[PDB]
């Protein structure tokens with residue numbers, strides 16, 4: 001049998017909280033732009049491998065990540081360093097490349113989201 005894992009942790013009241021220009025930009029600008037993109041929908045929540053009848057997804061992907069979880073981490077002040085968020089976006093993209101194969105439709109879609117991501121963080125405030 002196959003059960004999805006629990007989503008990644010998103011909120012923990014023991015972790016200290018800080019508001020930074022970079023974390024606010026990642027929420028208010030970057031996540032916003034990726035979220036309306038044409039290709040955002042597969043990435044807006046955890047991959048539901050039970051629904052999709054994919055029992056190997058979580059055999060292959062051991063560090064799940066998605067924009068819904070990133071949104072939550074940002075808005076719940078889970079991240080301390082901006083690079084924690086940028087690492088979660090890279091995990092999301094790379095999970096797609098790992099599970100799938102070069103040139104697959106969803107890989108082309110992830111590649112385009114990644115290109116938008118990189119253009120947006122080029123303008124990360126200091």
Ligand SMILES: Cc1nnc2n1-c1ccc(-c3ccc(N)nc3)cc1N(c1ccc(Cl)cc1)C[C@@H]2C
Nearest residue numbers: 041042043047048052054095096099100105106109
């Ligand atoms: C992210 C990610 N990384 N690999 C996958 N995905 C993926 C995640 C969710 C879904 C999906 C599929 C149907 C639905 N109703 N909601 C979400 C499809 C995906 N994939 C997908 C395949 C083709 C296209 Cl055009 C879009 C998404 C395939 C595969 C499971």
